[PDB]
Design an enzyme around this catalytic site. Structure first.
Site, mmCIF file in Angstrom:
data_model
loop_
_atom_site.group_PDB
_atom_site.id
_atom_site.type_symbol
_atom_site.label_atom_id
_atom_site.label_comp_id
_atom_site.label_asym_id
_atom_site.label_seq_id
_atom_site.Cartn_x
_atom_site.Cartn_y
_atom_site.Cartn_z
ATOM 1 C CG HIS A 19 -0.248 0.139 2.511
ATOM 2 N ND1 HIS A 19 0.159 -0.940 3.263
ATOM 3 C CD2 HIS A 19 0.100 1.242 3.213
ATOM 4 C CE1 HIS A 19 0.738 -0.508 4.369
ATOM 5 N NE2 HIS A 19 0.714 0.813 4.363
ATOM 6 C CG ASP A 37 0.731 -4.478 3.219
ATOM 7 O OD1 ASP A 37 1.112 -3.872 2.194
ATOM 8 O OD2 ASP A 37 0.520 -3.907 4.310
ATOM 9 N N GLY A 64 3.059 6.567 9.293
ATOM 10 C CA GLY A 64 4.349 7.038 8.837
ATOM 11 C C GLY A 64 5.466 6.019 8.926
ATOM 12 C CB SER A 78 3.298 2.018 6.344
ATOM 13 O OG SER A 78 2.167 1.681 7.117
ATOM 14 N N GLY A 79 5.889 0.052 5.853
ATOM 15 C CA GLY A 79 6.940 -0.408 4.975
ATOM 16 C C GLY A 79 8.273 -0.607 5.661
#
Lengths: 223, 163
Positions: A40, A84, A175, A177-178
Site C-alpha cells: 500500500h 502486503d 508514517g 509503514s513499509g
C-alpha cells in the site's frame, strides 16, 4: 514510533525512506539493488533515500536513488490487506558504508516472544501528531497467533503476525509503514497496519516476510 | 492508486489533519449538522448556507501511512483525532433515504472511499468493502442540502486544509 528511543546515525543501516518530495513510508534494503516495503506504499516515481538519520537536513552520507521498477505483490488485495508486500528496484546500486548496509532475508519464521526491533519516522504520540526529525527505534516481541486473532477478529490472515504490548503505549504508527521488523539480525516483518496507535488491546499487525522469500528470490532473479 | 490532495497541492494526511469540504456547486455551503425527523440531537450531515466555513473532517485508515489513496477504505469523522464521536455512517431513514449520519462508534475499516470526479472529489459509499459503490449527492429539503446516496449524481468537493 510510539514509546521508542533514538536509534543513532549508523544504528539502522538497513532503514530507508520512500519519497516523492516528502517522506511517506519506510522500507528495508535487502541487497545492493533491491528494497522491500509495503504494497500500500506504492506510488508512481518513487525516489528512495538511504542513510538518513535526520530527514530534514542533507547530512551528506545520504544517497537519493530513484526506483527503476515498483512491483507490488501480484496477490495484493486492496480490501483485505493480505499479501502486503512490494519490491522496489533501484536504478543504480547503493554504495555500502557505515550508514548504509543491507539486511538479510529470514531463513525461518520467528516464534512468539522473540525480541524484535521496529524503526521509522512515524508519530510518537497515541493521540495527536508529532513527527521527529531523527530516526526512532523500538524493541518489541512477537505475540502468539491465538491472541492476534482475538484482537482483530476475522482480519488476521496466514501471512500476518501481531507484535507489541497488550498494555499499549509501545507500538508503530502512521508514517512507519513499509519499515523493518528485525529479529536476530533478520528481516522478519514489515510494518503494515493497526487500530490507531499503541491503544490497549490494539497491537500492531505486520506482514510476515518469511512467506515471500522464494517470491523475492524469483522476482530478483527474473528482473 | 492516486493520492488524495488538498487545494494547496499537499497530500491528505492520515487522521493527522482536518480538512474543509468546499463544494464547487455550492460555494456558500459548509458541512454542518441537522435533524431529520423526530430526533432530539442533530445527527444528520447537511450543507448549510448558515455555516461557513463548515465543519472540518478527518480521514482515518488503519494503514500506518501518512497519506490517503483512492483505494483505501476510510473512516470520516468530526472533532478530535482519537475520539469516537462524530463518525459518519449511512442509515436508512425517511423521508430522505440513505442519509449520511453521525454515530459514536468507529469501525476498523470504514465504508467510504474518496474518488476523483469532474474537477474535484466525491465521497463514495460501499455498503460493504468488496461491493459496488454509491455516490453521495444532495437531497433538497428545508432550505439545506442533506448529504445522501444519489448514484450517478455525485456531490463534488474541494478539500481545503484546516490551517
Amino acid at each position: 514510533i510510539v514509546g521508542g528511543y533514538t536509534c543513532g546515525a549508523n544504528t539502522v543501516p538497513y532503514q530507508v525512506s520512500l519519497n516523492s518530495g516528502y517522506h511517506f513510508c519506510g522500507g528495508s534494503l535487502i541487497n545492493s539493488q533491491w528494497v522491500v516495503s509495503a504494497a500500500h506504499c506504492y506510488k508512481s516515481g518513487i525516489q528512495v533515500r538511504l542513510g538518513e538519520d535526520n530527514i530534514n537536513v542533507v547530512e551528506g552520507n545520504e544517497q537519493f536513488i530513484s526506483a527503476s521498477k515498483s512491483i507490488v505483490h501480484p496477490s495484493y488485495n486492496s480490501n483485505t490487506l493480505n499479501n502486503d508486500i512490494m519490491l522496489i528496484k533501484l536504478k543504480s546500486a547503493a554504495s555500502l558504508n557505515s550508514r548504509v548496509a543491507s539486511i538479510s532475508l529470514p531463513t525461518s519464521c520467528a516464534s512468539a516472544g522473540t525480541q524484535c526491533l521496529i524503526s521509522g519516522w512515524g508519530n510518537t504520540k497515541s493521540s495527536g501528531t508529532s513527527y521527529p526529525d531523527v530516526l526512532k527505534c523500538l524493541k518489541a516481541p512477537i505475540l502468539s497467533d491465538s491472541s492476534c486473532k482475538s484482537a482483530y477478529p476475522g482480519q488476521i490472515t496466514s501471512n500476518m503476525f501481531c507484535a507489541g504490548y497488550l498494555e499499549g503505549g509501545k507500538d508503530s504508527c502512521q508514517g512507519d509503514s513499509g519499515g523493518p521488523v528485525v529479529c536476530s539480525g533478520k528481516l522478519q516483518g514489515i510494518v503494515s497496519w493497526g487500530s490507531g496507535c499503541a491503544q490497549k488491546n490494539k497491537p500492531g499487525v505486520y506482514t510476515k516476510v518469511c512467506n515471500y522469500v522464494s517470491w523475492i528470490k524469483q522476482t530478483i532473479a527474473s528482473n | 492508486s492516486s493520492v488524495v490532495v488538498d487545494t494547496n497541492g499537499q497530500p491528505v494526511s492520515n487522521g493527522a489533519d482536518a480538512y474543509y469540504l468546499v463544494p464547487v456547486s455550492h460555494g456558500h455551503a459548509g458541512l454542518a449538522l441537522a435533524k431529520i425527523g423526530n430526533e432530539a440531537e442533530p445527527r444528520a450531515v447537511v450543507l448549510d448556507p448558515h455555516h461557513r466555513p463548515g465543519l472540518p473532517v478527518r480521514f482515518e485508515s488503519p494503514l500506518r501511512i501518512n497519506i490517503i489513496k483512492e483505494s483505501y477504505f476510510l473512516n470520516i469523522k468530526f472533532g478530535p483525532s482519537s475520539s469516537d464521536s462524530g463518525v459518519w455512517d449511512v442509515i436508512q431513514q425517511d423521508p430522505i433515504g440513505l442519509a449520511v449520519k453521525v454515530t459514536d462508534t468507529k469501525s476498523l475499516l470504514g465504508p467510504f472511499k474518496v474518488e476523483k470526479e469532474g474537477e474535484g472529489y466525491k465521497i463514495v459509499y460501499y455498503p460493504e468493502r468488496g461491493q459496488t459503490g454509491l455516490d453521495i449527492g444532495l437531497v433538497h429539503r428545508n432550505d439545506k442540502y442533506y448529504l445522501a446516496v444519489k448514484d450517478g449524481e455525485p456531490c463534488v468537493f474541494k478539500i481545503r486544509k484546516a490551517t
